[PDB]
């Protein structure tokens, strides 16, 4: 019938590849030559179960001049992808204390889909060696379970834009979470 | 000339002086900048150059629109430039397509949609709200609803029937109101 429009906004720390994930879901090809800092004004056609949904993608950054404009993309949101880095432990202790309060205050009563990106990099030799140099280890799935438990996330899964795993499933889950109007 | 800042760009585009855009090609390409960056957009509302050009129309014709669109497509962010939503709470969601429709300019909306203008962008700002909810004009929060609510049958026919992209009349806005619901909403009891 008539496709329903749902607004998805992706929030994550710097250099997490959220924009890379957006491009790889959009054109089904990872851009290895040019990665725009933000992907904006895109609508994607998705189907979950007998429904057609146009998902409008919004990307928020904080590298420069984007932190002040981050609150401008919060109102009238429908679903949030709260993402972190699997190959970066410091990307998990920053999840609850600074992202969560502002996302809850600005846009309350919305489903939370916290995800971890670059799932293939947790087994990379270089990242493991660099982490073990300062006594750190890749983000374990137990860490993701704890993250989903303490923030009450709708669902958590690992995606890697390099090997194209579960991105369609991730966005299907996000749209499904957006389907229920609280 | 050799330096293109935001106030200068808006000063040129308000008057529709196309010749001053001749130097627009190198300056961007030399500096790897885009028309959609924060430098070239109004800080108050997030308005870009295209809505400013469409707002300031001389006798209904602004010759700088095709040149701006061509430079945007050569820049590589044509899609991101065509539909640049406003950011202020007072005009949130408005798109250059909405401004073209609200100006009763069929040629500009034709030339805009055919190259990638989203026909479902919901103008859900505080200005586009019912008069009983702190607003001035509620047209249905949709380009097709707006075209139907401003009594523009030709643009409605073009939007519904166009090879490029058609906006289905069964689509619902944020309120759930379809095109018929919006057309009822704008209606008065006057005969005309």
């Amino acid at each position: 019938m008539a496709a329903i429009r749902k607004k998805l906004v992706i929030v994550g720390d710097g250099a997490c590849g959220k924009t890379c994930l957006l491009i790889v879901f959009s054109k089904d090809q990872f851009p290895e030559v040019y990665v725009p800092t933000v992907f904006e004004n895109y609508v994607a056609d998705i189907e979950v179960d007998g429904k057609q949904v146009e998902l409008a993608l919004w990307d928020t950054a904080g590298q420069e001049d984007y932190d002040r404009l981050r609150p401008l993309s919060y109102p009238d949101t429908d679903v949030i992808l709260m993402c972190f880095s699997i190959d970066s432990p410091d990307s998990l202790e920053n999840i609850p204390e600074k992202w969560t309060p502002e996302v809850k205050h600005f846009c309350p009563n919305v489903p939370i889909i916290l995800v971890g990106n670059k799932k293939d990099l947790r087994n990379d030799e270089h990242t493991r060696r660099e982490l073990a140099k300062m006594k750190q280890e890749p983000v374990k799935p137990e860490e993701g379970r704890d993250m989903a438990n303490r923030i009450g996330a709708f669902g958590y899964m690992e995606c890697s834009a390099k090997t194209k795993d579960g991105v369609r499933e991730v966005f299907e889950m996000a749209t499904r979470a957006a389907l229920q109007a609280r | 000339l050799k330096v293109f800042n935001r106030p200068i760009l808006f000063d040129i585009v308000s008057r529709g002086s196309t010749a001053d855009l001749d130097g627009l090609l190198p300056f961007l390409l030399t500096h790897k900048k885009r028309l959609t960056d924060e430098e070239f957009r109004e800080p108050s509302t997030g308005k870009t150059c295209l809505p400013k050009a469409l707002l300031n129309l001389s006798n209904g014709r602004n010759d700088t629109i095709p040149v701006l669109l061509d430079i945007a497509e050569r820049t590589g962010n044509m899609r991101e430039f065509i539909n640049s939503p406003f950011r202020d709470i007072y005009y949130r969601g408005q798109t250059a397509l909405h401004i073209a429709i609200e100006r009763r300019c069929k040629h500009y909306v034709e030339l805009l949609v055919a190259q990638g203008a989203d026909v479902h962008a919901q103008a859900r700002g505080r200005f586009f709200q019912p008069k009983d909810e702190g607003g001035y004009f509620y047209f249905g929060e949709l380009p097709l609803s707006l075209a139907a609510c401003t009594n523009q049958p030709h643009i409605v026919n073009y939007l519904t029937e166009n090879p490029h992209k058609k906006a289905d009349m069964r689509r619902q806005d944020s309120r759930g109101n379809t095109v018929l619901h919006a057309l009822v909403a704008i209606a008065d009891n006057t005969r005309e």
Side-chain angles (χ1 to χ4, degrees), chain A residues 69-86 88-103 105-107:
Chain A
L69 306 168
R70 281 182 42 246
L72 279 73
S73 56
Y74 294 151
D76 291 331
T77 187
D78 284 8
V79 57
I80 62 170
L81 273 172
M82 184 177 177
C83 69
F84 63 91
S85 171
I86 294 296
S88 170
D90 69 292
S91 66
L92 62 83
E93 41 275 30
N94 57 12
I95 300 299
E97 70 275 16
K98 175 281 291 183
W99 286 107
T100 301
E102 52 76 20
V103 65
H105 166 267
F106 274 115
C107 64

Side-chain angles (χ1 to χ4, degrees), chain B residues 54-157:
Chain B
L54 288 151
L55 271 171
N56 311 301
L57 290 170
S58 45
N59 66 50
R61 273 283 189 173
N62 200 348
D63 283 88
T64 191
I65 298 284
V67 178
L68 271 155
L69 292 163
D70 290 336
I71 193 66
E73 83 167 340
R74 293 290 41 81
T75 307
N77 60 345
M78 187 66 203
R79 176 272 314 295
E80 308 88 299
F81 181 66
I82 297 169
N83 49 359
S84 49
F86 288 22
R87 315 190 304 210
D88 61 335
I89 199 66
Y90 195 72
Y91 285 119
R92 194 144 44 67
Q94 173 154 270
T95 307
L97 188 79
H98 292 243
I99 300 174
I101 295 162
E102 205 164 9
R103 285 294 174 268
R104 320 187 88 240
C105 295
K106 188 189 178 192
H107 41 85
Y108 275 6
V109 54
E110 286 174 89
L111 188 153
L112 203 62
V113 65
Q115 65 183 357
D118 179 27
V119 293
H120 303 142
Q122 308 183 32
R124 52 192 301 170
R126 264 203 80 180
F127 179 73
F128 317 113
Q129 295 287 70
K131 299 179 181 67
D132 51 55
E133 210 160 346
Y136 293 72
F137 191 51
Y138 178 55
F139 45 69
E141 285 181 19
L142 203 70
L144 179 50
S145 313
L146 171 59
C149 288
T150 59
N151 188 35
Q152 309 191 27
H154 300 307
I155 293 175
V156 175
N157 285 334

Side-chain angles (χ1 to χ4, degrees), chain A residues 18-27 30-31 33-46 48 50-66 68-86 88-103 105-112 115-118 121-122 127 131-132 136 138-139 141:
Chain A
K18 45 195 173 295
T19 317
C20 295
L21 188 153
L22 291 203
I23 317 304
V24 73
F25 167 87
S26 72
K27 305 213 61 53
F30 193 98
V33 61
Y34 190 20
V35 174
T37 185
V38 286
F39 193 38
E40 69 275 16
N41 320 129
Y42 196 54
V43 298
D45 291 331
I46 188 74
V48 288
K51 324 182 91 153
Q52 209 167 5
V53 183
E54 293 179 353
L55 183 63
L57 302 154
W58 290 58
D59 189 358
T60 70
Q63 64 182 177
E64 69 274 15
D65 221 334
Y66 280 112
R68 54 181 321 290
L69 306 168
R70 281 182 42 246
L72 279 73
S73 56
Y74 294 151
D76 291 331
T77 187
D78 284 8
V79 57
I80 62 170
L81 273 172
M82 184 177 177
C83 69
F84 63 91
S85 171
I86 294 296
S88 170
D90 69 292
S91 66
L92 62 83
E93 41 275 30
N94 57 12
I95 300 299
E97 70 275 16
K98 175 281 291 183
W99 286 107
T100 301
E102 52 76 20
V103 65
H105 166 267
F106 274 115
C107 64
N109 291 318
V110 291
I112 297 89
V115 298
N117 54 23
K118 309 163 298 205
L121 300 193
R122 66 205 312 198
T127 53
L131 286 193
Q136 278 96 33
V139 182

